[PDB]
Design a protein around this ligand. Structure first.
Ligand SMILES: [Cl-]
Length: 250
């Protein structure tokens, strides 16, 4: 790591080695493993080997984030997939928002993957930096708007500023991912928050149409905003995913 700053408390990765079925969990662009930990812990308790990496540049400081490329984030996820592949003979991938993009990405590169569970995955965002920069303002940083989360008793540990260099990287990742949806053939379970105010719910439909997966479904989350893994629909996400995992374990 060319990471210059230490890991925030609560942002540590999580590994657990249980049975031969594995789940890789991928957190999002602003966030840290915190947003995915309740899922990871529930899947580990159900008997799954679980890998929840901390993406390079995340969970430290926004300056660390600034120098990373999407290639670094892919590498973090690839190394998590590799850790799982050593230990498991069945692999599922799930992730929130950008972690959903990275989940799609990984499925495109490894069809040995037995299934994917993207949640509010980002594939085509019109408002990249919705009204902080124009095409030629080019501030270094945009102030972050806060968490799009309904439940007020939980929180994200995401940075307060987003490097605009990182947004460029994110747009490039979404392009290479959306372009290659047809490469995905494993079972897909697609969560979408009706009231996502960050990633347009229509991304669900683009994912659904673009993959060549024969077993695919869209599940609507009615009581959650964008950060659904921490929101009121958390238990529903966990219970439906567990059902998904069991029914496709190989
Ligand atoms: Cl977080």
């Amino acid at each position: 790591m060319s990471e210059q700053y230490p890991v925030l408390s609560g942002a540590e990765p999580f590994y657990a080695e249980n049975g031969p079925v594995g789940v890789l969990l991928v957190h999002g662009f602003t966030g840290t493993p915190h947003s995915m930990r309740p899922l990871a812990e529930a899947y580990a308790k159900a008997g799954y080997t679980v890998c929840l990496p901390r993406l390079k540049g995340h969970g430290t400081h926004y300056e660390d984030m600034e120098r990373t490329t999407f290639h670094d984030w892919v590498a973090s996820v690839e190394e998590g997939y590799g850790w799982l592949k050593q230990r498991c003979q069945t692999i599922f991938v799930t992730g929130l928002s950008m972690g959903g993009t990275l989940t799609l990405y990984l499925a495109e590169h490894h069809p040995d993957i037995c299934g994917i569970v993207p949640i509010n995955a980002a594939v085509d965002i019109p408002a990249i930096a919705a009204g902080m920069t124009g095409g030629g303002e080019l501030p270094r940083y945009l102030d972050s708007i806060g968490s799009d989360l309904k439940n007020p008793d939980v929180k994200e540990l995401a940075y307060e500023k987003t490097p605009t260099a990182s947004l460029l990287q994110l747009a490039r990742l979404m392009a290479q991912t959306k372009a290659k949806l047809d490469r995905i053939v494993c079972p897909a379970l697609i969560f979408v928050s009706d009231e996502d105010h960050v990633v347009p719910p229509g991304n669900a439909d683009i994912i659904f149409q673009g993959i060549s997966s024969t077993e695919k479904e869209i599940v609507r989350l009615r009581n959650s905003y964008h950060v659904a893994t921490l929101d009121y629909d958390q238990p529903m996400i966990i219970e439906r995913s567990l059902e998904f995992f069991a029914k496709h374990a190989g």
